[PDB]
């Protein structure tokens, strides 16, 4: 009995590899996110379930994330291209402290600074004063205030017809390539998965920019589930997803005006107007006992991978960078720096809550220092409601003696926001050419 | 008001099945090497002329075409072009396994077989190329005596 | 300083003729699918050339998966289902053009494709290896 060779088509062979992906707006159902260079898609991608397949995923090691980060950065730069640069601002300022109709916790904040600035004709000049913050100018030698970033990268202005709200995004599969999907509920970020189905497009994904808390995220199935690779390596981070959301009120407590100043030919800058009314400070407000129930669920889920007679302690974070000092986000085209150093005073054996917030204007982007974009102050009263879906936790090293472990917030690498969503999907290559042995023989 | 109905085999419908039975969905599996989005792409096919992004899409399309050409051309080198399967004249080397066929054809799947035989590759390619050369043209030249 | 000496058929000249007679000019179209070349402008040139390549490879792949590859017109073993039309064999071949027939059957395409793929796979290739052994 001699045996022979045969060669086949159609064998599904999987090679874990990398490719450029395929943008998809949800039928382009409609600005920064005007997303004209993207594709209208089916709101009902077809879903095919499988059998018998086990498959390993590897969270933190997926090239979807890096492509996502580059694409969102380049689209962010694309939106801010055609608008008017702000080069002649780097003259000095004649300032004075605002001493009119003060409130308690807004001392030293607002300043009144007047200066020379050119008109649209070269041969002239003018006098302009505008109301400015304290987090934006520096002393020189009234006192004399120059600006924060004139001895570094330049400053432009976003156009006022350009919204900041995120839009749900789908990714889909380029030809020749496939996407697999797991359906376990308690599936940790690595390890196998025996329940396999496949699609051609992702679900709706919102590019949400947050700094300390998962906002507008995805709720889990059952409870708190905890995601990290190596909890003994305390240099890593710990990704935590909730079950149930937390409603959170934060609002701009003030009434606001805005000027419109001419710079040059076709060059108009928007400065801050003059405030109608008195002065307040921005605040944030949450439930009381629901937070306690939430951290009770936290304690209930921490007990598996480490000790339960080990006592749980919360603390303020280590401090430092304003990227990770306050919790920041993008409600209503404005950026909020909220003093979260009161919510994390806790230690447990395993109505209204109010915190102040801060506002800036000169906004460096993701981690880059070679870019600076200025927002126009929006008039009126801003109110923003959202949810809270998860936390990013850091633990110190050297925590010996089997109890009283300390947890702190942090994690200023915003790819983990994407890792907190894309933990289900995997891109793989098809190689349809296969061989096999058999007993038959061909003929001449 | 959209209701669904009757069924077919479908894309990747037999990846966890017995190879002797899963050997018959090769058509639907092999159709989508050049598609998968078989839908108004033409407008963005048109107006993306002054950017790098349509250039990268052009990169992707040309690369996919070349991969299909590499596969079909390498099959075309052998005398098995234009077919789904073919038998040949290389005797199997029983050094590579000695399992009976009743386990492979009944209780073994494709990815298992992939993880088994993944080092014997280029030897098999060379032997198939040899039998598609030796006496496939030489004795065929000797079979060209009319 | 030229003259004109027409010999062969026109490009799509037979389109207004009847199907069974216009079946004999099928060469000229496939003769004229991939020619015409025989800053922004070269960009859209390459765009057009890539589109032509893609459609030609798509249709040759659809030829190749069927057992009617390489050659021109052929046969099969799928018996006709009369749920699509019910003519009596003269009204089509002698009394109907191609655009008429295309507007008559442009809802049943994918089923016919799939069933030809089915009969091309099944009882043709596993059956071949059944016949390749006593």
């Amino acid at each position, epitope marked *: 009995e001699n045996l022979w060779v045969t060669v086949y088509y159609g064998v599904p062979v999987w090679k874990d590899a990398e490719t450029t992906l395929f943008c998809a707006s949800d039928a382009k159902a409609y600005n920064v996110w005007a997303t004209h260079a993207c594709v209208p898609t*089916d*709101p*009902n991608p*077809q879903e*095919i379930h499988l059998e018998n397949v086990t498959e390993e995923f590897n969270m933190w090691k997926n090239n979807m994330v890096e492509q996502m980060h580059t694409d969102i950065i380049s689209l962010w730069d694309q939106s801010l291209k055609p608008c008017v640069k702000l080069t002649p601002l780097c003259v000095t300022l004649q300032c004075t402290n605002v001493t009119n109709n003060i409130t308690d916790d807004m001392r030293g904040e607002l300043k009144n600074c007047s200066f020379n600035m050119t008109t649209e004709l070269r041969d002239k000049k003018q006098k302009v004063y505008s109301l400015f913050y304290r987090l934006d100018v520096v002393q020189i030698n009234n006192k004399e205030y120059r600006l924060i970033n004139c001895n570094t990268s330049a400053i432009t202005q976003a156009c006022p017809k350009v919204s900041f709200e995120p839009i749900p995004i789908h990714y889909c599969a380029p030809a020749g390539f496939a996407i697999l999907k797991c359906k376990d509920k308690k599936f940790n970020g690595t390890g196998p998965c025996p329940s396999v189905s496949t699609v*051609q497009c992702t679900h709706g994904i919102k590019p949400v920019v947050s700094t300390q808390l998962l906002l507008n995220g995805s709720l889990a199935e059952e409870e708190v589930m905890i995601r990290s690779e190596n909890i003994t390596n305390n240099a890593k981070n710990i990704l935590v997803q909730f079950n149930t959301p937390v409603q959170i009120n934060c609002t701009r407590p003030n009434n606001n005006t805005r000027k419109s100043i001419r710079i040059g030919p076709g060059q108009a800058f928007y400065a801050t107007g003059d405030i109608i009314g008195d002065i307040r400070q921005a605040h944030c407000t949450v439930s009381k006992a629901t937070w306690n129930e939430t951290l009770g669920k936290v304690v209930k889920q921490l007990r598996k991978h480490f000790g339960n007679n080990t006592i749980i302690r919360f603390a303020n974070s280590s401090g430092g960078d304003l990227e990770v000092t306050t919790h920041s986000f993008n409600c209503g085209g404005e950026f909020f720096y909220c003093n979260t150093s009161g919510l994390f005073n806790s230690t447990w054996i395993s109505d209204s809550i109010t915190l102040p917030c801060r506002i800036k204007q000169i906004i460096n982007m993701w981690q880059r220092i070679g870019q600076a974009m200025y927002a126009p102050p929006i008039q009126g009263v801003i109110r923003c409601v959202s949810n809270i879906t998860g936390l990013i936790l850091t633990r110190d090293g050297g925590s010996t003696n089997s109890t009283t472990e300390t947890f702190r917030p942090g994690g200023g690498d915003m790819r983990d926001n994407w890792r907190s969503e894309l933990y289900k999907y995997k891109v793989v290559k098809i190689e349809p050419l296969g061989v096999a042995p058999t007993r038959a023989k061909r003929r001449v | *008001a*959209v*209701g*669904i*109905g*009757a*069924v*077919f*085999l*479908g*894309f990747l*419908g037999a990846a966890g099945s017995t190879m002797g039975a899963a050997s018959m969905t090769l058509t639907v599996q092999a159709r*989508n090497l050049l598609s*998968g989005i*078989v839908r108004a792409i033409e407008a963005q096919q048109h107006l993306l002329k002054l950017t790098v992004w349509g250039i990268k899409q052009l990169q992707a399309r040309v690369l996919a075409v070349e991969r299909y050409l590499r596969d079909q051309q390498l099959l075309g080198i052998w005398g098995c072009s234009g077919k789904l399967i073919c038998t040949t004249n290389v005797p199997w080397n029983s050094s590579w396994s000695n399992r009976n066929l009743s386990e492979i054809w009944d209780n073994m799947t494709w990815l298992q077989w992939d993880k088994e035989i993944s080092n014997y590759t280029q030897i098999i390619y060379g032997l198939l190329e040899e039998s598609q050369n030796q006496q496939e043209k030489n004795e065929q030249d000797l079979l060209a005596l009319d | 300083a030229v003259g004109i000496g027409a010999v062969f058929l026109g490009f799509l000249g037979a389109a207004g003729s009847t199907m069974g007679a216009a079946s004999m000019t099928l060469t000229v179209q496939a003769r004229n699918l991939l020619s015409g070349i025989v800053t922004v402008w070269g960009i859209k040139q390459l765009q057009a050339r890539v589109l032509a390549v893609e459609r030609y490879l798509r249709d040759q792949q659809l030829l190749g998966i069927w057992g009617c590859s390489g050659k021109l017109i052929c046969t099969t073993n799928v018996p006709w289902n009369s749920s699509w039309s019910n003519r009596n064999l003269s009204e089509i071949w002698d009394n109907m053009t191609w655009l008429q027939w295309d507007k008559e059957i442009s*809802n*049943y395409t*994918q*089923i016919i494709y799939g069933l030809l793929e089915e009969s091309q796979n099944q009882q043709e290739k596993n059956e071949q290896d059944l016949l390749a052994l006593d």
Partner: antibody
Amino acid sequence: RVQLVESGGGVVQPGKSVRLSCVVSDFPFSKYPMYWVRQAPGKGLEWVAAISGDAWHVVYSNSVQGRFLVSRDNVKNTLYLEMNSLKIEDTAVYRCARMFQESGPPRLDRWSGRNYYYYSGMDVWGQGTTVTVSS
Amino acid sequence: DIVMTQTPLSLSVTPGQPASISCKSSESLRQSNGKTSLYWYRQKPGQSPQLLVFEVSNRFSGVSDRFVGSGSGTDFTLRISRVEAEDVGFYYCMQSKDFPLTFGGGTKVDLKR
């Protein structure tokens, strides 16, 4: 033109069975699916059930599920509606109806195999029929 | 399921007096093709139901040109014009986006008695 017929109404008791009828004049029935609606005497209105173009797609509601049956011959131009395991609160008016336009042949999706059907809502009614359930 | 709402039910006006009836819901009833599912129906007591329109601002054969509605996306509406004798009765809103099919509230117009 096109004119509807709704027979089989009155008063019954629980624990029974019915067969209904709807024959509508001069209409093809090879291309047209059709519906059922329901008029409670307290002005309750609710969709009931739908048939395909050729009896190949059966979708019911929640309360009627696993109890009723729809069947149809298009040759005899005759519709059959049969009900079992009768509740007392089934007291209402039953009315036969038609689709707005005709759908065509079924659509296929090649990347799935899921042979799709397409529907759209109704246009016209008839006279209806009234079956009430009491003790 | 996919549900909806109407305006308040009763209405009693005089002839030559336009008004507005809306119909909101919980979802965009846009389908894939761009056709957006919305039916307006009416009847009276002692009267079978009747077809008024079949789409957003698209009316049916036999209906007068007095009755053309509006409203797209998730807010759907209707505008009464030229109040006449036969303008009384029940006014219905209907979905056909997905199973099951839903029936609205049934606003009503009559005269003063």
